[PDB]
Design a protein around this ligand. Structure first.
Ligand SMILES: OC[C@H]1O[C@@H](O)[C@H](O)[C@@H](O)[C@@H]1O
Ligand SMILES: [Ca+2]
Length: 768
C-alpha cells in the first residue's frame, strides 16, 4: 500500500477490507417483520432533503433513499467505477470493475466482476469516505475520496443532490503505465414512482462545457417527458479535465443486456467510442459512461474529479401531497438541472473539502479524545442525511420557512418523533440550529390542534381521539401518509396521555435557546404559549395531588411497552426540569405570574419526588409497579437536561452522583462486563429486569446520553467506558456489524431492534 501516503485519511476513519466477510453479524431480536439489510453498507452520499444513496464498502450503489421516506436495498449493478491498466511493453492491458461482487443474473456478464479480496480498503469519516485499490495485477495504485458537502451552519450546499469522487492515481513501479478510470451509471428515471412502462422515454445526452481552463464532459440521463411528477427528472455523471488526461464517453449502453457494447471498448485500451445517441428507449434499460485515460510515468501522481448529481425535484408522500425538495431553491424546480448541479460540484469541490476539514478539525485535533470516540461522533451523523429526511421548498401547485423532518427510523416511519428527538436532535441544535428551531416551531403550532376522529390503539385495541388540544403530538406524520399535515401517525399507544411528551417539548425549547447563545428571545416568544399550555395540561394528570403527573400503569412514555405507575423517576425528573425551564423562560420574557406558578409547582414536586423515590443509593423506577425498585439507566433524564440547560441542581448533587455510580456499577458493569452499553433495567440483586423486552435492552441513544450526563458530572472514565460499548457493538470487528445503521436497541446476545434509528444521534450531547 503506497497510495495512502498520497491522500489524507484521518486515523479515526472507520475501516474495513473491500470484500471482507463479517462473521458475527446481528439480526432482529423480534418475531415480527423488521428491516435487515445486512452489514454491506457505507456512508451515504447526498444532502439533506435531497434523497440519499448508500454506496457500500464493497463499491456498490445499494441503499436507495431517493424516494423520500423509503429504504430500498438493491444493488444497481450498472453503477460502478471501473479501471483499465496496461504496462508499456505488454500486448494486453487488464480491466476490472471496482465491485467485490457480481450480478445475480446475466446482465452485464461481459464486465469483469468480483474485485478480489485483500486488495483494498474502505474508510469512512462522514461526510467523507474513501476506497484504496492496492492490487497485485494493477501496478498503478488508486484511491478515491467521495463526499457530499454536508457543512454545519450552511443550509445551501448541505441540501444538494450531489456527490464528488476525487481520484488519486500513483505509479510506484519503474515502468510507464496507461491508466483509465470509468464511471458508469444507469438512467434510473422510473426506478421509483412510475406505475407503468418504467424505462419508456428514457434518453441520454452528452454535454461538453469547454471554457478557458475548465473542460467538463457530462452525461445527462433523463426522459423525453416534461411532466412534473415525482418520478421525473435527471441524473448526471461527469468529469473535469485536468492536465495530462483525455476524456472519452459513451452516451448509451444497454443495462438490460450483456454490457459488451461498452466493455469491448474499455477492456481493449480504456478508451470509449465517444458515440452520442439521444434515441429514447422503450423497454430496455440504458446507461451512460464517462472515462479518463492517462499515462503515468514512474513516481508520478495525478488527481482527477468526477461527480454525480440527481435532479428529482418532487417528493410525493403516500397521502398524495407533493412538495418541492429544498435544493430546488438554488437550481430550479423543472427537473432539467442536473448538469448545473454537477458543474457547481466539479468547479467548487476543493472549497467544499476545505469547509468540511474546517468543521471536523476542532474535534480531530483534540488529542485528549480517543480516536474511537471521533469515529462514532462523525459517523453517527450519517443518519441526518439517511433518515428519510424531508425539507420542503413549497407544495406543488401552491411562504418564508421550509418545513423539515427526520424520521425516527424506517420500521416505524414517523417524522420527528418527539420522545426520541429529545435525544436525537443534538446535532441539529449544535450544527444546523435554524433547522432545529423550525422543527420546534412546527411542534409549537400543533399544541392546540384537536382532531376528534378516533383510531384503534394497537396495544389494547381500544378507540381513542387522534389529537387532544394542549397535548404535544408524538410525531408529525408518516411518509406513507401526510408529513406535517396529519400528525400522530403513531398508534401503538395513545400519545395524548403520555407523561413525557409535554415536558420533553418544554425542555427542547429551552435547550434550543440556551445552546444557541441565550439570545433568541423571539424563539422563546413564539413558543411561550405552547410551553405554558403543555405544562398546564400535564399538571391535570396528577391524580393524588403530590404535584407530579401520575403514570397510569400502562406504557405512557417513550419506553412504549414498559409500564410505569405512580411517580416515576423518568417522567418525574423530566417534569421537575421542565418546570425549572419554564420558570427561567418566564423570567426572560417578564411573565411574573408564570414564574411564580411554576416556581411553586416545582418546589412542591421536588420535595415529593425526593421523598417518594430516593432510597439511599439511587432513585426508584417508580412508586407503584411490581418491580418499582429496579435501577433504571435513564432514571435522572431530567437532571441530565438540566445540566445541559444550566438550570442547576434539581436533585441533590450527592444523590445524583450516587445514582450515576450505581447505574455504572450495575446497568453497565454487570451487563456483559460493561462491553455493550447500559441495560435499561436492572434489579438491585444485579440481575437484568425481565419484566419487559425494553428493560432487558440497551438503547443506544439512552446510553450515549447517559455517557454525556456522566461526563458533565466528572465521571470521565465511566462516561467513556459506557459509550465505548456502543461504539464497539456498532463499529468494531468484535461487534455486531451495525455501521451506518445504528439501531435503537440490542439484547445481551447482541441482536437488535430497529436499525437506522434517530436516537443514537444523542452522542453529540457529549460535545456540549
Ligand atoms: O423503541 C421505542 C420507540 O418505539 C417507536 O415505535 C415509537 O414511535 C417511539 O415513541 C418509542 O420510543
Ligand atoms: Ca401524582
Amino acid at each position: 500500500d503506497k497510495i495512502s501516503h498520497k491522500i489524507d485519511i484521518p486515523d479515526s476513519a472507520w475501516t474495513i477490507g473491500i470484500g471482507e466477510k463479517f462473521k458475527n453479524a446481528g439480526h432482529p431480536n423480534v418475531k415480527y417483520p423488521m428491516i435487515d439489510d445486512s452489514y454491506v453498507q457505507g456512508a451515504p452520499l447526498g444532502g439533506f432533503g435531497a434523497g440519499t444513496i448508500g454506496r457500500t464498502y464493497n463499491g456498490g450503489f445499494s441503499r436507495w433513499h431517493l424516494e423520500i421516506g423509503k429504504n430500498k436495498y438493491t444493488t444497481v449493478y450498472a453503477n460502478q467505477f471501473s479501471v483499465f491498466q496496461k504496462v508499456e511493453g505488454n500486448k494486453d492491458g487488464v480491466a476490472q470493475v471496482l465491485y467485490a461482487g457480481e450480478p445475480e443474473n446475466g446482465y452485464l456478464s461481459s464486465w469483469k466482476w468480483d474485485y478480489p479480496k485483500e486488495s483494498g480498503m474502505y474508510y469512512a469519516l462522514y461526510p467523507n469516505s474513501w476506497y484504496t485499490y492496492t492490487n497485485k495485477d494493477l501496478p498503478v495504485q488508486l484511491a478515491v475520496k467521495q463526499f457530499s458537502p454536508i457543512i454545519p451552519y450552511n443550509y445551501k450546499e448541505t441540501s444538494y443532490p450531489v456527490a464528488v469522487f476525487k481520484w488519486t492515481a500513483y505509479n510506484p513501479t519503474n515502468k510507464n503505465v496507461d491508466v483509465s478510470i470509468m464511471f458508469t451509471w444507469q438512467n434510473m428515471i422510473g426506478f421509483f414512482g412510475k406505475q407503468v412502462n418504467v424505462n419508456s422515454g428514457n434518453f441520454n445526452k452528452i454535454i461538453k462545457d469547454k471554457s478557458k481552463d475548465s473542460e467538463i464532459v457530462a452525461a445527462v440521463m433523463g426522459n423525453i417527458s416534461n411532466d412534473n411528477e415525482e418520478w421525473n427528472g435527471e441524473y448526471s455523471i461527469g468529469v473535469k479535465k485536468v492536465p495530462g488526461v483525455d476524456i472519452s464517453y459513451k452516451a448509451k449502453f444497454v443495462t438490460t443486456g450483456d454490457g459488451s457494447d461498452l466493455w469491448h471498448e474499455f477492456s481493449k485500451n480504456g478508451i470509449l467510442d465517444n458515440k452520442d445517441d439521444e434515441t429514447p428507449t422503450k423497454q430496455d434499460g440504458i446507461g451512460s459512461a464517462i472515462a479518463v485515460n492517462f499515462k503515468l510515468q514512474p513516481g508520478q501522481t495525478i488527481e482527477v474529479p468526477f461527480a454525480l448529481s440527481w435532479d428529482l425535484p418532487i417528493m410525493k408522500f403516500g397521502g398524495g401531497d407533493k412538495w418541492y425538495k429544498m435544493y430546488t431553491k438554488y437550481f430550479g424546480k423543472n427537473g432539467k438541472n442536473s448538469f448545473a448541479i454537477l458543474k457547481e460540484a466539479l468547479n467548487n469541490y476543493q472549497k467544499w473539502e476545505k469547509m468540511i476539514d474546517d468543521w471536523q478539525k476542532p474535534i480531530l485535533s483534540n488529542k485528549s479524545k480517543p480516536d474511537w470516540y471521533k469515529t462514532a461522533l462523525f459517523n453517527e451523523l450519517y443518519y441526518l442525511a439517511d433518515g428519510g429526511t424531508a425539507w420542503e421548498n413549497g407544495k406543488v401547485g401552491e411562504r418564508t420557512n421550509n418545513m423539515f423532518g427526520l424520521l425516527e427510523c424506517f420500521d416505524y416511519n414517523y417524522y420527528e418523533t418527539l420522545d426520541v428527538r429529545f435525544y436525537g436532535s443534538f446535532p441539529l441544535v449544535m450544527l444546523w440550529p435554524d433547522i432545529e428551531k423550525q422543527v420546534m416551531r412546527q411542534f409549537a403550532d400543533t399544541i392546540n390542534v384537536q382532531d376528534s376522529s378516533e383510531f384503534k390503539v394497537g396495544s389494547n385495541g381500544a378507540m381513542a381521539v387522534k389529537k387532544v388540544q394542549g397535548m404535544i403530538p408524538h410525531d408529525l406524520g408518516s411518509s406513507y401518509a401526510l408529513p406535517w399535515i396529519k400528525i400522530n401517525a403513531y398508534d401503538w399507544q395513545n400519545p395524548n396521555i403520555w407523561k413525557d411528551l409535554n415536558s420533553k417539548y418544554v425542555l427542547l425549547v429551552y435547550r434550543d435557546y440556551v445552546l444557541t447563545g441565550k439570545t433568541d428571545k423571539e424563539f422563546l416568544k413564539y413558543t411561550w404559549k405552547s410551553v405554558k399550555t403543555a405544562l398546564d395540561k400535564l399538571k391535570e394528570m396528577d391524580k393524588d395531588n403530590d404535584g407530579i403527573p401520575d403514570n397510569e400503569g400502562i406504557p405512557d412514555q417513550t419506553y412504549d411497552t414498559w409500564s410505569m405507575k405512580g411517580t416515576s423517576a423518568y417522567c418525574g425528573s423530566l417534569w421537575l426540569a421542565a418546570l425549572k425551564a419554564a420558570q427561567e423562560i418566564g423570567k426572560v420574557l417578564k411573565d411574573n405570574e408564570a414564574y411564580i406558578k411554576y416556581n411553586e409547582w416545582y418546589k412542591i414536586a421536588q420535595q415529593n419526588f425526593e421523598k417518594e423515590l430516593w432510597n439511599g443509593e439511587y432513585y426508584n423506577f417508580d412508586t407503584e409497579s411490581d418491580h418499582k425498585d429496579s435501577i433504571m439507566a435513564d432514571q435522572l433524564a431530567g437532571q441530565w437536561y438540566a445540566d445541559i440547560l444550566r438550570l442547576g441542581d434539581i436533585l441533590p448533587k450527592d444523590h445524583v452522583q450516587k445514582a450515576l455510580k450505581k447505574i455504572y456499577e450495575f446497568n453497565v458493569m454487570k451487563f456483559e462486563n460493561g462491553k455493550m452499553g447500559a441495560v435499561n433495567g436492572m434489579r438491585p440483586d444485579g440481575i437484568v429486569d425481565e419484566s419487559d423486552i425494553q428493560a432487558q435492552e440497551v438503547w443506544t441513544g439512552v446510553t450515549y446520553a447517559l455517557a454525556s450526563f456522566m461526563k458533565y458530572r466528572g465521571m470521565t472514565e465511566e462516561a467513556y467506558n459506557t459509550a465505548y460499548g456502543v461504539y464497539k457493538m456498532t463499529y468494531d470487528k468484535s461487534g455486531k456489524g451495525y455501521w451506518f445503521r445504528t439501531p435503537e436497541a440490542w439484547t445481551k446476545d447482541g441482536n437488535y431492534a430497529a436499525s437506522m434509528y434517530m436516537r443514537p444521534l444523542s452522542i453529540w450531547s457529549m460535545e456540549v
